[PDB]
Design an enzyme around this catalytic site. Structure first.
Site, PDB file in Angstrom:
ATOM      1  N   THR A  65     -55.617  46.791 -46.846  1.00 59.33           N
ATOM      2  CA  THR A  65     -56.673  45.961 -47.411  1.00 59.33           C
ATOM      3  C   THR A  65     -57.488  46.739 -48.438  1.00 59.33           C
ATOM      4  O   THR A  65     -58.156  47.717 -48.102  1.00 59.33           O
ATOM      5  CB  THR A  65     -57.616  45.425 -46.319  1.00 59.33           C
ATOM      6  OG1 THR A  65     -56.872  44.620 -45.396  1.00 59.33           O
ATOM      7  CG2 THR A  65     -58.722  44.585 -46.938  1.00 59.33           C
ATOM      8  N   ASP A  73     -55.508  42.174 -52.863  1.00 52.95           N
ATOM      9  CA  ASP A  73     -54.082  42.034 -52.618  1.00 52.95           C
ATOM     10  C   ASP A  73     -53.792  40.799 -51.767  1.00 52.95           C
ATOM     11  O   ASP A  73     -54.694  40.111 -51.285  1.00 52.95           O
ATOM     12  CB  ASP A  73     -53.534  43.293 -51.945  1.00 52.95           C
ATOM     13  CG  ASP A  73     -54.230  43.607 -50.632  1.00 52.95           C
ATOM     14  OD1 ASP A  73     -55.236  42.939 -50.308  1.00 52.95           O
ATOM     15  OD2 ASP A  73     -53.769  44.522 -49.920  1.00 52.95           O
ATOM     16  N   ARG A 132     -51.642  41.130 -49.059  1.00 52.29           N
ATOM     17  CA  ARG A 132     -51.115  41.637 -47.799  1.00 52.29           C
ATOM     18  C   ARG A 132     -52.216  41.652 -46.745  1.00 52.29           C
ATOM     19  O   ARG A 132     -53.233  42.335 -46.910  1.00 52.29           O
ATOM     20  CB  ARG A 132     -50.525  43.034 -47.981  1.00 52.29           C
ATOM     21  CG  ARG A 132     -49.867  43.589 -46.726  1.00 52.29           C
ATOM     22  CD  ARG A 132     -49.316  44.986 -46.957  1.00 52.29           C
ATOM     23  NE  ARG A 132     -48.229  44.987 -47.933  1.00 52.29           N
ATOM     24  CZ  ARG A 132     -46.958  44.738 -47.637  1.00 52.29           C
ATOM     25  NH1 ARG A 132     -46.607  44.467 -46.387  1.00 52.29           N
ATOM     26  NH2 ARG A 132     -46.036  44.761 -48.590  1.00 52.29           N
ATOM     27  N   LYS A 136     -56.952  36.553 -49.407  1.00 51.55           N
ATOM     28  CA  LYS A 136     -58.181  36.952 -48.736  1.00 51.55           C
ATOM     29  C   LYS A 136     -59.434  36.557 -49.502  1.00 51.55           C
ATOM     30  O   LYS A 136     -60.542  36.854 -49.044  1.00 51.55           O
ATOM     31  CB  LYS A 136     -58.184  38.465 -48.495  1.00 51.55           C
ATOM     32  CG  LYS A 136     -57.136  38.941 -47.506  1.00 51.55           C
ATOM     33  CD  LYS A 136     -57.149  40.455 -47.379  1.00 51.55           C
ATOM     34  CE  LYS A 136     -56.125  40.931 -46.364  1.00 51.55           C
ATOM     35  NZ  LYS A 136     -56.080  42.416 -46.274  1.00 51.55           N
ATOM     36  N   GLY A 154     -61.539  44.100 -43.327  1.00 48.72           N
ATOM     37  CA  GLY A 154     -61.728  44.351 -41.907  1.00 48.72           C
ATOM     38  C   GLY A 154     -61.264  43.158 -41.095  1.00 48.72           C
ATOM     39  O   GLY A 154     -60.127  42.692 -41.233  1.00 48.72           O
ATOM     40  N   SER A 173     -59.633  49.414 -46.125  1.00 46.91           N
ATOM     41  CA  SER A 173     -59.023  50.684 -45.745  1.00 46.91           C
ATOM     42  C   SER A 173     -58.595  51.488 -46.964  1.00 46.91           C
ATOM     43  O   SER A 173     -58.579  52.724 -46.916  1.00 46.91           O
ATOM     44  CB  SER A 173     -57.828  50.440 -44.823  1.00 46.91           C
ATOM     45  OG  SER A 173     -56.808  49.719 -45.491  1.00 46.91           O
ATOM     46  N   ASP A 222     -52.258  53.334 -49.354  1.00 46.99           N
ATOM     47  CA  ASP A 222     -52.734  52.692 -48.137  1.00 46.99           C
ATOM     48  C   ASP A 222     -51.619  51.865 -47.508  1.00 46.99           C
ATOM     49  O   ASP A 222     -50.872  51.167 -48.200  1.00 46.99           O
ATOM     50  CB  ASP A 222     -53.943  51.805 -48.442  1.00 46.99           C
ATOM     51  CG  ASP A 222     -54.582  51.230 -47.188  1.00 46.99           C
ATOM     52  OD1 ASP A 222     -54.159  51.593 -46.071  1.00 46.99           O
ATOM     53  OD2 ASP A 222     -55.510  50.405 -47.324  1.00 46.99           O
ATOM     54  N   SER A 251     -52.526  47.995 -47.553  1.00 49.95           N
ATOM     55  CA  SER A 251     -52.548  47.400 -48.883  1.00 49.95           C
ATOM     56  C   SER A 251     -51.140  47.366 -49.459  1.00 49.95           C
ATOM     57  O   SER A 251     -50.358  48.303 -49.275  1.00 49.95           O
ATOM     58  CB  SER A 251     -53.476  48.182 -49.814  1.00 49.95           C
ATOM     59  OG  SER A 251     -54.819  48.116 -49.367  1.00 49.95           O
TER      60      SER A 251
END
EC number: 3.4.25.1
Lengths: 250, 241, 244, 217, 226, 41
Positions: E1, E17, E19, E33, E47, E129, E166, E169
């Site tokens: 994320t 993103d 994902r 998102k 989160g 993250s 990440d 991500s």
């Protein structure tokens, strides 16, 4: 703090009907004449604004508000009671629906909640009933085009073409003869301008006339298109300058 | 009869108590004049002159609700201070939930509904005052919203109250038809204040001194009230013409 | 007696009847006539409508015809606005029994709850009773088909064929004269249409002014079939029964 | 350009600049020449966006035919507009046909062509649509007989028209009908029928307000 | 994320993103998102995703209520103010991470809120993250007063840095361009690293490879209420 | 009593024309006036 009978909802007429309903319809009968028409391809609603002082601005007073732009609204009734009702109608429509389904509220469910607001004023003692007569015009994907009339008595009924105001008795006959089910939205707009003009002929221009229609979804009115699936606002308010363009061609 | 004392509808379908709310508005007999200029808003209200045992400075019909926001009230003065505290409370609580300057159009909506709740309640009586809110909006500029005691609000080019309001409204109506504009020229707010005094004296037919009137001023990012020396200074330049 | 005292619900008349109640059914009698008919093979419900305007849409809206659940289907005769809360409350209580016990609610459980709701306004508080005539058409295995009528009272009474609203005594006479012990469904439809024709001042008796809903297990091909009949099918029924 | 409004305004100034023949060829080019998009029913071009400016060019052509002596061909061009009504403005010849006769009032036209456009086309573009709307140009029919100075056929129609025009079509329309009825008996030196028709017109004129073109008369 | 956004002269642009991963196992391949507050104000959650959709729906309801009640579009601070008060009431119970971004008649603004209840202000902000990896890109190649084209390419590389670094991500990138005075442009699936690769063997199971014990017919059409 | 109002209006339009006969055009005008007089006052 409760004082004696102050919740008393005893008033009743000898005929059995609620006396508060007859006195509410009497005030609306003298009020400014509104109207509305549900056509095949669209729905049109129109009303005359309030003059009062000649220095008053027509942009301040808006007789057509917006709940969610799947539905239009117009009122010939109480001016102040409309602002309080819309504030409560949205909070009920948001809590009971938008806080659950998070979408645009359907027409059938929204009208049922507005009818409860007028009932709570009659059910709760000490509070006078709402003297507003609301015309709820909206378009959904199930029932299609729907035009509902919410009386101050607390009940709602569908109408093909209806009018409320001083000329409501005369306009009811005009909508039967002039308007037919085979007429489309463009045909209903011209009738809405002629029927409303016959009420008060003092000023027929667009400054004193507020016209709004519910058409097809417009992507420009939403302000953003990232998703081709999401539909745009179906409710579009016409500018007074655009109203005068149709008056010259009428 | 009893139909006048009941809160519910009358036999004519029209509330008499709403009409009786305007009976107390003429007690003070104050004629207020407020116009919408270009960058500024000029508000002038009559200040009644009592005997020598009272302080004319403490007597005012105009109060400061918030920054750039001001209110003139024509009606019962003791009922005005109770309504003034209601507008001041909603002004500060609005910024805590949002954080931007509270516009005048919304402030006229809140005080109209709260005054309308009193009409529905069988205990609390409606406010018998007149709520006129003036400020300078960011997007809409100068705006004047006169809130009726029953919860109705609409904007006016030039507001007028009191029994002489017909003289002020008519004299200022023809003045706006010649220029065909709701605003006033001379963008500088100094001379705009002086333009409203001359139109008020010619309409009322009586020239008032600095102690017979009070002049509110609404500017950009500032709100204040002209003192006795500032009001007297305005009559000096008006006298020379 | 001498002076007519109507102020509070606690005040009792020398006749023993609250003056607020005197106008409860008289307002219902001012509205349309709702006549329920309980048969052996089902229950037939027929009611007219108060609105006389042609511009109103009577095809997509049923004023007196409502559906509480898949089994119980009632008819509201009275003030339409004041009944909207008691109808949704009935649907809440009907689901409460279905939520806890995982079983469809019978008629008696629903009527006893709606009975105390009417009395709740007259017993405690200074509120007013909402005059409504409920005609309960349910389904039950124990007692078979059940038909009850709830006045703005808080009590219920069983009826084979009941008539409320306008011309109560006039329509009930036509029901008791043509009543049959066999009482099929097709016969119950004819007795419902012929009775409403004589009570209503309109001799034509158009299809859009009637509410035709039949709960029957005797439908075509010998099966249990439930439907809310649209006015389009009502017009064809008036021709077969000889009304049109 | 390639626009219906661009070539229309460009040819408008070509009348006084060079000749009126070059202006008519441009207006006719917006009809038959090219102009094909999507699908519609017109008879000249095909598009839904060209329907507005083509009817305006007809008003310019019809004005030039009467002035230059080509009005003999114009009387047959009006009934040919029925095919355009299947698309433009969803029938409603009042935007076109009513404006075509209006050009005959501004620009003087012979009484033969003015009346022929009312007699030959009397049923407007459709059988069903004009049942209610037949009263629009039915009033101007008797108006043309005044310049014709023939009050026989004009009065014979009004006698049959007054029976069907009472609260069966348009209530205020009788104000204009009874107004012109007084002019029929005015030249006939009949006071009884003129006073009776004018009194009923002025009495019924209190329920409506006409924009200055009636009450002033 | 990874949630990154950058302002510019005519407005602010934000990117995120597709994902969405729940735990060590990737939940969805492509999941948007970005949630809406007002038509011109967008917010992307990080989160806990449920606390994102729960708070945005409740707070966004009163914000849409505030728009039509005042006959004026709310400012950017209005969306942040009632959002900050909702998280502070529970003293950090709700773990919703949001980025306040939008345009108002006043100007361009960008804000970030945390579960602890503290807000933040700045030109560019990162969240998730991948905020540690995405912040490094904006600290080097960034220059003052970027144009509309330079802001889109920078926001694309900021999310791409978290795709290859990440773990949470990756997948595609959803870029939403918000310009003052014009319509908000939301680009669906802007930066696509790759697509679904065809397997080396096609798997098709013919009828009869799985034994059936019993068979029943369930009618989902209209059923008789009686 | 209102039925005789139609009888009075039947001769009202005939009095303006000074005609002692009532044709079919007078019946339509007579009923239109009575319907307005009955609803007025």
């Amino acid at each position: 703090m409760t004082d004696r009978y102050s919740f008393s909802l005893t008033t009743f007429s000898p005929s059995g009907k609620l006396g508060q309903i007859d006195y509410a319809l009497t005030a609306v009968k003298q009020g400014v004449t509104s109207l509305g028409i549900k056509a095949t391809n669209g729905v049109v609603i129109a009303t005359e604004k309030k003059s009062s002082s000649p220095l008053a601005m027509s942009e301040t007073l808006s007789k057509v508000s917006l709940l969610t732009p799947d539905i239009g609204a117009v009122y010939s009734g109480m001016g102040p009671d409309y602002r309080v009702l819309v504030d409560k109608s949205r909070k009920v429509a948001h809590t009971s629906y938008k806080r659950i389904y998070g979408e645009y509220p359907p027409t059938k469910l929204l009208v049922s909640e507005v009818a409860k607001i007028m009932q709570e004023a009659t059910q709760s003692g000490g509070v006078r009933p709402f003297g507003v007569s609301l015309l709820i015009a909206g378009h959904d994907e199930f029932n299609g085009f729907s035009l509902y009339q919410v009386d101050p008595s607390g009940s709602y009924f569908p109408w093909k073409a209806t009018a409320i105001g001083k000329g409501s008795v005369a306009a009811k006959t005009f909508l039967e003869k002039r308007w037919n089910d085979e007429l489309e939205l463009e045909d209903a707009i011209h009738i809405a301008l002629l029927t409303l003009k016959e009420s008060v002929e003092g000023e027929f221009n667009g400054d004193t006339i507020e016209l709004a229609i519910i058409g097809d979804e417009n992507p420009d009115l939403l302000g953003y298109t990232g998703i081709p699936t999401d539909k745009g606002p179906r409710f579009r308010k016409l500018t007074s300058q655009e109203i005068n363009d149709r008056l010259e061609a009428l | 009869g009893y139909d006048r004392h009941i809160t519910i509808f009358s036999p004519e379908g029209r509330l008499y108590q709403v009409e009786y709310a305007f009976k107390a508005t003429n007690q003070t007999n104050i004629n207020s004049l407020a116009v919408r200029g270009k960058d500024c808003t000029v508000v002038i209200s009559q200040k009644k002159v009592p005997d020598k045992l009272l302080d004319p400075t403490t007597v005012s019909y105009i109060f400061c609700i918030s920054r750039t926001i001001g209110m003139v009230v024509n009606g019962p003065i003791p009922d005005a201070r109770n309504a003034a505290l209601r507008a001041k409370a909603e002004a500060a609580e609005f910024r805590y939930k949002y954080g931007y300057d509270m516009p005048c159009d919304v402030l006229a909506k809140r005080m109209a509904n709260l005054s309308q709740i009193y009409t529905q309640r069988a205990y609390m009586r409606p406010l018998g005052v007149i709520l006129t809110f003036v400020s300078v909006d960011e997007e809409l500029g100068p705006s004047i919203y006169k809130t009726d005691p029953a919860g109705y609000y609409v904007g006016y080019k030039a507001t007028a109250t009191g029994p002489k309001q017909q003289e002020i409204t008519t004299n200022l109506e023809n003045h706006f038809k010649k220029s065909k504009i709701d605003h006033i020229n001379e963008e500088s707010w100094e001379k705009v204040v002086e333009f409203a005094i001359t139109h008020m004296i010619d309409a009322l037919g009586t020239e008032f001194s600095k102690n017979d009137l009070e002049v509110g001023v609404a500017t950009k990012d500032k709100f204040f009230t002209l003192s006795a020396e500032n009001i007297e200074e305005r009559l000096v330049a008006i006298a020379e013409q | 007696g001498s002076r007519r005292y109507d102020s509070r619900t606690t005040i009792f008349s020398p006749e023993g009847r609250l003056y607020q109640v005197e106008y409860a059914l008289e307002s219902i009698s001012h509205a349309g006539t709702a006549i329920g008919i309980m048969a052996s093979d089902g229950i037939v419900l027929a009611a007219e409508r108060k609105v006389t305007s042609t511009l109103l849409e009577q095809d997509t809206s049923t004023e007196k015809l409502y559906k509480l659940n898949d089994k119980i289907a009632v008819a509201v005769a009275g003030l339409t606005a004041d009944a909207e809360i008691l109808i949704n409350t009935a649907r809440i209580h009907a689901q409460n029994y279905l939520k806890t016990y995982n079983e469809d609610i019978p008629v008696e459980i629903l009527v006893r709850r709606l009975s105390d709701i009417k009395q709740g306004y007259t017993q405690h508080g200074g509120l007013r009773p909402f005059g409504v005539s409920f005609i309960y058409a349910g389904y039950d295995d124990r007692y078979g088909y059940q038909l009850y009528t709830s006045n703005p009272s808080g009590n219920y009474t069983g009826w084979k064929a009941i008539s409320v609203g306008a011309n109560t005594s006039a329509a009930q006479t036509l029901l008791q004269m043509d009543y049959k012990d066999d009482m099929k469904v097709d016969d119950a439809i004819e007795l419902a249409l012929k009775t409403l024709s004589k009570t209503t001042d309109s001799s034509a008796l158009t299809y859009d002014r009637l509410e035709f809903a039949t709960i029957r297990k005797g439908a075509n091909d010998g099966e249990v079939y439930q439907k809310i009949f649209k006015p389009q099918e009502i017009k064809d029924i008036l021709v077969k029964t000889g009304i049109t | 350009m390639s626009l219906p409004g661009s070539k229309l305004e460009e040819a408008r100034r070509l009348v006084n600049e060079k000749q009126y023949n070059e202006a008519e060829q441009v207006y006719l080019s917006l009809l038959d020449k090219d102009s094909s998009q999507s699908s519609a029913a017109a008879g000249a071009s095909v598009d839904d966006k060209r329907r507005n400016e083509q009817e305006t060019s007809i008003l310019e052509l019809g004005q030039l035919y009467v002035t230059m002596g080509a009005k003999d061909k114009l009387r047959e061009f009006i009934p040919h507009s029925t095919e355009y009504m299947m698309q433009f403005a969803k029938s409603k010849t009042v935007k076109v046909l009513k404006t075509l006769i209006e050009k005959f009032e501004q620009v003087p036209d012979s009484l033969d062509d003015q009346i022929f456009v009312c007699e030959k086309s009397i049923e407007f573009a459709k059988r069903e649509k004009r049942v209610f709307l037949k009263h629009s140009l039915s009033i101007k029919l008797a108006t043309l007989h005044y310049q014709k100075k023939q009050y026989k056929d004009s009065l014979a129609l009004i006698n049959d028209l007054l029976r069907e025009f009472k609260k069966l079509d348009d209530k205020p329309s009788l104000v204009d009908v009874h107004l012109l009825e007084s002019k029929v008996y005015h030249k006939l030196r009949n006071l009884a029928k003129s006073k009776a028709s004018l009194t009923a017109a002025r009495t019924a004129a209190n329920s409506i307000y006409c924009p200055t073109q009636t009450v002033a008369e | 994320t990874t949630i990154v956004g950058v302002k510019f002269n005519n407005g602010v642009v934000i990117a995120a993103d597709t994902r969405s991963t729940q735990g060590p196992i990737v939940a969805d391949k492509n999941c948007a998102k970005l949630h809406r507050i007002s038509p011109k104000i967008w917010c992307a959650g990080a989160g806990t995703a449920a606390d994102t959709e729960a708070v945005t729906q409740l707070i966004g309801s009163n914000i849409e209520l505030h728009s039509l009640y005042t006959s004026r579009e709310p400012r950017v601070v209005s969306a942040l103010q009632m959002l900050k008060q909702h998280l502070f009431k529970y003293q950090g119970h709700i773990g919703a991470y949001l980025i306040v971004a939008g345009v108002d008649p006043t100007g361009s603004h960008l804000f970030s809120i945390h579960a602890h209840g503290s807000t933040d202000v700045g030109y560019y902000l990162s969240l998730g993250s991948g905020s540690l990896a995405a912040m490094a890109v904006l600290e080097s190649h960034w220059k003052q007063d970027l144009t509309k084209e330079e802001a889109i390419k920078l926001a694309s590389d900021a999310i791409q840095a978290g795709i290859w670094n990440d773990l949470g991500s990756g997948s595609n990138v959803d870029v939403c361009v918000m310009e003052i005075g014009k319509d908000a442009e939301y680009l669906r699936n802007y930066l696509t690293p790759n697509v679904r690769e065809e397997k080396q063997k096609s798997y098709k199971f013919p009828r009869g490879t799985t034994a059936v014990l019993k068979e029943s017919i369930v009618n989902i059409c209209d059923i008789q209420e009686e | 009593a209102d039925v005789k109002g139609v009888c009075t209006e039947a001769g009202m339009y005939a009095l303006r024309e000074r005609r002692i006969h009532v044709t079919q055009e007078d019946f339509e005008l007579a009923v239109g006036k009575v319907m307005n007089k009955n609803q007025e006052t």
